[PDB]
Design a protein around this ligand. Structure first.
Ligand SMILES: [Zn+2]
Length: 40
């Protein structure tokens, strides 16, 4: 069963290198590629 929602499916890829960080300081997913649940 696990969580019945869970956050997004993205990940701090190149972002973590001070790039963009769609959620600077608050990033957990939404960022560069982030296609865990779309190719992984
Ligand atoms: Zn980030």
């Amino acid at each position: 069963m696990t969580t019945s929602s869970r956050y997004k499916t993205e990940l701090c890829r190149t972002y973590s290198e001070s790039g963009r960080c769609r959620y600077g300081a608050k990033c957990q997913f939404a960022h560069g590629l982030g296609e865990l649940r779309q190719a992984n």
